[PDB]
Scaffold this motif. Structure first.
Motif, PDB file in Angstrom:
ATOM      1  N   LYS A  78       6.096   1.832   8.690  1.00 38.40           N
ATOM      2  CA  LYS A  78       5.726   0.984   9.810  1.00 38.40           C
ATOM      3  C   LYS A  78       4.556   0.072   9.437  1.00 38.40           C
ATOM      4  CE  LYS A  78       2.983  -0.172  13.296  1.00 38.40           C
ATOM      5  NZ  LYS A  78       3.194  -1.261  14.290  1.00 38.40           N
ATOM      6  N   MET A  79       3.591   0.604   8.690  1.00 40.47           N
ATOM      7  CA  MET A  79       2.416  -0.166   8.289  1.00 40.47           C
ATOM      8  C   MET A  79       2.734  -1.405   7.454  1.00 40.47           C
ATOM      9  SD  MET A  79      -1.143   0.983   6.416  1.00 40.47           S
ATOM     10  CE  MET A  79      -2.141  -0.314   5.693  1.00 40.47           C
ATOM     11  N   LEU A  80       3.766  -1.322   6.625  1.00 41.14           N
ATOM     12  CA  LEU A  80       4.143  -2.470   5.817  1.00 41.14           C
ATOM     13  C   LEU A  80       5.104  -3.403   6.537  1.00 41.14           C
ATOM     14  CD1 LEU A  80       2.721  -3.080   3.346  1.00 41.14           C
ATOM     15  CD2 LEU A  80       2.849  -0.598   3.596  1.00 41.14           C
ATOM     16  N   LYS A  81       5.834  -2.871   7.514  1.00 43.20           N
ATOM     17  CA  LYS A  81       6.785  -3.667   8.282  1.00 43.20           C
ATOM     18  C   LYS A  81       6.064  -4.694   9.158  1.00 43.20           C
ATOM     19  CE  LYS A  81       7.290  -1.238  12.657  1.00 43.20           C
ATOM     20  NZ  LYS A  81       8.068  -0.291  13.498  1.00 43.20           N
ATOM     21  N   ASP A  82       4.878  -4.333   9.642  1.00 43.78           N
ATOM     22  CA  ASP A  82       4.093  -5.230  10.482  1.00 43.78           C
ATOM     23  C   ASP A  82       3.433  -6.337   9.672  1.00 43.78           C
ATOM     24  OD1 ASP A  82       1.139  -4.228   9.879  1.00 43.78           O
ATOM     25  OD2 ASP A  82       2.255  -2.418  10.395  1.00 43.78           O
ATOM     26  N   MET A  83       3.038  -6.015   8.442  1.00 37.95           N
ATOM     27  CA  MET A  83       2.397  -6.986   7.567  1.00 37.95           C
ATOM     28  C   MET A  83       3.423  -7.973   7.014  1.00 37.95           C
ATOM     29  SD  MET A  83      -0.717  -7.499   7.164  1.00 37.95           S
ATOM     30  CE  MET A  83      -2.019  -6.341   6.818  1.00 37.95           C
ATOM     31  N   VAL A  84       4.681  -7.552   6.945  1.00 43.13           N
ATOM     32  CA  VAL A  84       5.737  -8.433   6.465  1.00 43.13           C
ATOM     33  C   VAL A  84       6.271  -9.302   7.602  1.00 43.13           C
ATOM     34  CG1 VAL A  84       6.452  -7.096   4.472  1.00 43.13           C
ATOM     35  CG2 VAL A  84       7.406  -6.576   6.701  1.00 43.13           C
ATOM     36  N   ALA A  85       6.150  -8.802   8.827  1.00 39.59           N
ATOM     37  CA  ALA A  85       6.597  -9.535  10.005  1.00 39.59           C
ATOM     38  C   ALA A  85       5.629 -10.679  10.295  1.00 39.59           C
ATOM     39  CB  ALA A  85       6.690  -8.603  11.205  1.00 39.59           C
TER      40      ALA A  85
ATOM     41  N   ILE B 216       0.936  -1.107   0.000  1.00 40.44           N
ATOM     42  CA  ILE B 216       0.000   0.000   0.000  1.00 40.44           C
ATOM     43  C   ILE B 216       0.985   1.165   0.000  1.00 40.44           C
ATOM     44  CG2 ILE B 216      -0.341  -0.816   2.379  1.00 40.44           C
ATOM     45  CD1 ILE B 216      -2.258   2.084   0.627  1.00 40.44           C
ATOM     46  N   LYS B 217       1.415   1.489  -1.211  1.00 39.65           N
ATOM     47  CA  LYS B 217       2.384   2.534  -1.511  1.00 39.65           C
ATOM     48  C   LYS B 217       1.817   3.929  -1.335  1.00 39.65           C
ATOM     49  CE  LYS B 217      -0.329   1.098  -4.790  1.00 39.65           C
ATOM     50  NZ  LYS B 217      -1.211  -0.084  -4.593  1.00 39.65           N
ATOM     51  N   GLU B 218       0.948   4.094  -0.340  1.00 43.43           N
ATOM     52  CA  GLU B 218       0.283   5.366  -0.060  1.00 43.43           C
ATOM     53  C   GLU B 218      -0.649   5.653  -1.238  1.00 43.43           C
ATOM     54  OE1 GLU B 218       3.925   7.423  -0.180  1.00 43.43           O
ATOM     55  OE2 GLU B 218       3.365   8.922  -1.677  1.00 43.43           O
ATOM     56  N   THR B 219      -0.740   4.679  -2.144  1.00 37.26           N
ATOM     57  CA  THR B 219      -1.572   4.789  -3.330  1.00 37.26           C
ATOM     58  C   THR B 219      -2.763   3.843  -3.371  1.00 37.26           C
ATOM     59  OG1 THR B 219       0.272   5.547  -4.742  1.00 37.26           O
ATOM     60  CG2 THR B 219      -1.682   4.679  -5.853  1.00 37.26           C
ATOM     61  N   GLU B 220      -3.860   4.452  -3.781  1.00 35.02           N
ATOM     62  CA  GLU B 220      -5.199   3.923  -4.000  1.00 35.02           C
ATOM     63  C   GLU B 220      -5.684   5.352  -4.168  1.00 35.02           C
ATOM     64  OE1 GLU B 220      -4.918   0.375  -1.699  1.00 35.02           O
ATOM     65  OE2 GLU B 220      -4.625   0.509  -3.874  1.00 35.02           O
ATOM     66  N   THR B 221      -5.433   6.077  -3.081  1.00 33.41           N
ATOM     67  CA  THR B 221      -5.667   7.491  -2.891  1.00 33.41           C
ATOM     68  C   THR B 221      -6.219   8.363  -4.005  1.00 33.41           C
ATOM     69  OG1 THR B 221      -3.240   7.650  -3.084  1.00 33.41           O
ATOM     70  CG2 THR B 221      -4.195   7.953  -0.891  1.00 33.41           C
TER      71      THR B 221
END
Lengths: 532, 532, 532
Positions: A267-274, A241-246
């Motif tokens: 941070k938002m993508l780091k948690d989904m990858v963890a 979610i590259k800050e894009t949909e927006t």
């Protein structure tokens, strides 16, 4: 073989028709003769050219038809007869296009000066009805009884004739087919074996790629080069979610305190990858997979990273069989069944090394190896698949009969025998045709001593109830008898259609002795015709 | 058949008129002769060409008229006479365009040196008034009484002449017509049978597609390949609120806490897809159907997913009959009547396999099958529909009479007999024309022995009150009598119009013996004329 | 056989030499291959053309060389080698030009990268010295002992291969040769047999023209058509004193009494013609023979009259043998020895019938007959003379040895055996050449089974002291042994020169690996060269 490229005259058509059929015959006969020259068991070398290009081939009909673009409105029309038979592929098909393309000669002449071919049509179809009849074992000698592996070696004997190993490349390509036969969907089986050979240093003997190749990539740079035993993971496309949909319309109006928003998104993508790492899977596969920031995180947590667009690999992955039906956005924990953990033997040959681990399960597996180099291999690589695929279609039930080895020469004597039935006109062009179905298996002969018919009387001897087989071209002239590989084909089926494509096309190819046209444009650029 | 492509001279018109009608006759006669050659029951092969293209055909008038773009301002004018009769389609129509296009010869000459064709017009129309008269049974032998299935086989006997099965492809295509006759809207019936044949491996005997094909697609990728018995669902177009309608003008002004808005939108479509699943229907059909996120949800809840633009399939779906009148945006629970649950026999032939389940209901069903391959099939595929469609229009009352089999040859003797009435001028060009309506059924004859008229005296024998029928071309020369398939046509109606198109067009085709024009441009590019 | 007409480039020569010899070899090899194709015993059909003309031929070298005017300054140079051997004519000569034109290949390559062919020259000449050696019987089997009529039939077996009578046209043409051999001047014998065949209605078997044809003319009009048994006369050119020698300068000055001078002159020739009749000879032959006035006198006194220019007939007459050494102006009584009196069988075939009487005397006789028509005969007519002439030259003493039938194949094994002598360089290109002299008799083979060398091992068997002979092409593959007509040639001599023409020409054909020229004009029109 004169009149280079359809003589290159008669620019955009015109004139009268009754000499035109003889013209259609001339056009169909020439292209049929050029192909006949070393095609099928004769099979060897047919030289190609063009303006900067290459197409070396042998025994292939689709390739010859790929070319000679037009040259007369007759050549194009009958490219399709080969094309119609090309569906349910094979190489023995175009050799059969030659048999069909030949008798029409004694048939065009036939009753010289008769407007009614309507009789000849009743004949070819009758020969086809006889074809469904001979489908039921007429051979008797081999019958159907023999090890299926035998029929498999048979296809490896033919290969594409120009085969490097005039012998046992066989069960190599076959075990993969033995696996492919378990799938038996009619096409998904040929989809698994699909792709390559070569892609290795040097040449020689190698094969199989056992259970899974499924991917093509050195896998993106971090360290795909290292980490042997990366493990079972089967994520097939991580997107961010590259800050894009927006597009928002307006967003982030106020200044200064953005020190949070910037850090929070990464941070938002780091948690989904963890969380995805929690699966303890680690390996990543992905078309649209670039997640650079939480990729460095994935680098720490997932051996490596990958990056772009191979969809066929995902369908090939469905064959790897890691349950990858559902993979959108987030949180799915239940599925991870793809093989074991051992992966990627690094850096041989060049560019990319990629084949996955193996935790046994027969099908939905790949088939490609170092074998030989590109051009010399291109041809041997494909012909062997045609070998693995055509046999795959016919291996299923509904058929029993020894093929080739002149099983045809006397199948035709039966056709000549039915001529006993006085009426199909009189001439029994059905029989007169049969005569050709008898002359063609001889056109196959190629040479032996010199010319032919010397061996035809040889075939006549011992078939009344004995059976036909073994006629070969290798130094030893085999009249009949065993392991000359007889007529490798059993799967004999292909003749069923090889026989049919003839009767249908050859009829509308004839009876068309009118106009030959003076056509106005439907294509472009054309207008007006010149000759009168 | 000289003067290639209208001789290609007389570029943009000029000159005097009284030789021009003879010129119009020449132009109309030539195109009428080229078509006459093997058209109708003669029917076989007419060779085509062009600059890169194909149009093989037989018995078809629209196809021949599709071509020879212009060649004289006379040829184009009378393409429409065939075209006018083409409405309420058939193949016997253009054969009738030949009968009309022929006598005009003995009529143009006729009273050689008379300016008044005004007499000939009274005649052709009179022949038409006689046509409505002979519509009422004149045959007597077959009359109208015979099994309707008989008249159905009759159409299968003609097919498109170039028919592969010179016999019973009949009731196959007919049962679907027997269903089609129940609809009887005059066109919606031909809309259901509409589409294809072939699309299968090899050739041979196959037909019907029983109750529903209605769709074309392997259905989008998830697993349309699997899930047999997907079930009754009939959603025909799911669209998503892709955050678009908007354009807003401005939206999402403030930063940071967007972690909700992103998750909530995907949530908005997930609930609407979960409710649609509540129907327990599952299968999805859709032109504008891509809902990727809640598609993965639909994948879990609805076997598979589909994706693009076939509207004709929806109208074909209205025929599948799943009540799909209302389908906009959200919440509709009441309708779901489309057949049963069994769907999609996977992967045969290639590309796509698609035919829906069957929970019995006669009409609004499809009609297409493997039959034969593209080019050889294209022609047999269409001609058989013309066979299924033309019979469908006439079968609905108001008509009773045996057609063909020279029922015409003596219908015309009646026309020659009415010539007893001394005045329609004197010559009774109406009668002189009748003579031609008598000579044409003979032009049909094609050959038999050689030339003709040998068999005409044969037809004269036994018709005073006996009736006409059975004249055939197959080896057995049938004078008259039963099952020679007589004149397959009963539906004899088509003659009603085949007779009319003549009288109207042939009159304004003549009496037009003036100028022939020296036209200034209305089209382009033209200007000035050259000849004086 | 590519590079049509010497590829038609390199207009007027230039460039460097060391690739040019390979170029000379290419040019000499191509023309040698085209001729080799069906030449000699292969012999059959070589098709010709041109701008309006005809030259059908077989086994002839002079004819092939008559053509392909130039195409490279190498082809013309070696046309002469055939030409040099053409002197002392024959057909087996050019077949020998092929044997010479072949090994030069293994010789040009030979010691690949050696500037000294000076070694190879010592070899070819050595093979020639061996040739004079094998001239003395090496065959042993036939030796020389056999009926000479046998060797005569042998030449009739070869004829020109394309012989109508694959057998005994023999002694027909031979008796005339048996007569010709008595003359034995080396050329005057071939001069008598000289002229024609055909010139008769139809075709079939006819020959000889026994003792005298000597003239060509229906003989001028009076009555040559009649008067059989005209008699012995041999006047070969009567001229008149046409009041011309004169020119006078001035003559007949006075008028009136010229009634005497006119009558007296006609009188002067009448007396000279009356005296010539006194010979009681009667028949007249004459180039410049018109004596119109005393010709009417000669008509009364000498059966007929003749009129123009055939001198070769007079030399042919010297062969008729009527002593015609002295024939100027007047009075010679002593000579008249030409045959008997029976003359001219009138009007068959057409134009002229002329053959003189026969009062026995063996030679100085003609040889021509109806045989066959012009084009089909032209070739069979000439080849048979080459058959009668070449045998005529060699029939004389100085030679003894069976020819052909591979007598050469082992003559060459002797050549390969002499290679035992270690030095002629080392390679003994003399021997390496011998190998070719061994391969060529095999190139003759043409085919039999397919290709060759299968029969070479067959020839090796039974020659150590047994002898070679009988290798044939007719269905029966004859290894060796009698009446297969062995090697028809004995006269074996021709090989003496066929062997020599090689050694001389092939040497200066090579060692010429320089420049290849950039020539300035000596012929026309040429100037400047283009390439640098």
């Amino acid at each position: 073989m004169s009149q280079q490229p359809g003589v290159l005259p008669e620019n955009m058509k015109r004139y009268m028709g009754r000499d035109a059929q003889r013209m259609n015959i001339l056009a169909g006969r020439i292209i049929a003769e050029t192909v006949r020259s070393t095609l099928g068991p004769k099979g060897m070398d047919k030289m190609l050219v063009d303006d900067l290009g290459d197409v070396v081939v042998t025994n292939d009909g689709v390739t010859i038809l790929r070319e000679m673009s037009v040259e007369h409105p007759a050549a194009k029309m009958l490219i399709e007869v080969a094309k119609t038979q090309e569906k349910e592929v094979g190489d023995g098909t175009t050799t059969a296009v030659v048999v069909a393309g030949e008798l029409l000669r004694k048939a065009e002449e036939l009753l010289d000066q008769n407007v009614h071919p309507t009789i000849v049509v009743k004949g070819y179809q009758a020969a086809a009805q006889k074809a469904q009849e001979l489908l039921k074992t007429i051979a008797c000698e081999v019958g159907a009884q023999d090890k299926e592996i035998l029929t498999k070696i048979a296809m490896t004997s033919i290969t594409g004739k120009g085969a490097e190993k005039a012998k046992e490349k066989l069960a190599e390509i076959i075990v993969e087919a033995v696996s492919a036969v378990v799938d038996d969907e009619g096409k998904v089986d040929k989809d698994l074996i699909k792709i390559e050979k070569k892609s290795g240093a040097s040449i020689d003997d190698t094969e199989l790629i056992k259970g899974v190749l499924v991917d093509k990539e050195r896998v993106s740079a971090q360290m795909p080069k290292k980490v042997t035993d990366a493990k079972i993971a089967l994520l097939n496309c991580a997107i961010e979610i590259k800050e894009t949909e927006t597009d928002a319309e307006i967003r982030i109006t106020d200044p200064a305190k953005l020190m949070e928003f910037i850090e929070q998104e990464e941070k938002m993508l780091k948690d989904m990858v963890a969380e995805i790492k929690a699966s303890g899977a680690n390996v990543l596969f992905c078309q649209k997979g670039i997640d650079d920031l939480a990729q460095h995180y994935l680098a720490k947590e997932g051996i490596v990273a990958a990056r772009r667009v191979k969809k066929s690999d995902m369908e090939k992955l469905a064959k790897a069989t890691g349950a990858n039906v559902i993979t959108n956005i987030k949180d799915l924990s239940a599925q991870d069944l793809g093989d074991a953990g051992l992966v990627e033997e690094r850096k041989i040959s060049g560019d990319s090394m990629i084949f996955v681990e193996e935790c046994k399960h027969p099908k939905a597996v790949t088939m490609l190896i170092r074998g030989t180099t590109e051009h010399v291999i291109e041809e041997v690589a494909r012909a062997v698949d045609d070998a693995v695929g055509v046999v795959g279609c016919t291996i299923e039930d509904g058929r029993i009969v020894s093929g080739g080895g002149s099983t045809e020469v006397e199948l035709s004597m039966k056709l000549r025998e039915y001529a006993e039935g006085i009426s199909g006109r009189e001439q029994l062009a059905v029989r007169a045709f049969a005569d050709a179905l008898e002359v063609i298996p001889r056109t196959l002969a190629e040479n032996a001593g010199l010319d032919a018919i010397e061996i035809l009387v040889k075939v006549r001897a011992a078939h009344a109830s004995n059976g036909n087989k073994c006629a070969g071209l290798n130094v030893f002239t085999g009249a009949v008898e065993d392991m000359c590989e007889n007529g490798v084909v059993e799967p004999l089926r292909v003749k069923t259609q090889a026989i049919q494509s003839a009767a249908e096309s050859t009829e509308m190819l004839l009876r068309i002795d009118d106009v030959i046209a003076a056509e106005k444009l439907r294509g472009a650029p054309d207008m007006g015709d010149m000759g009168g």
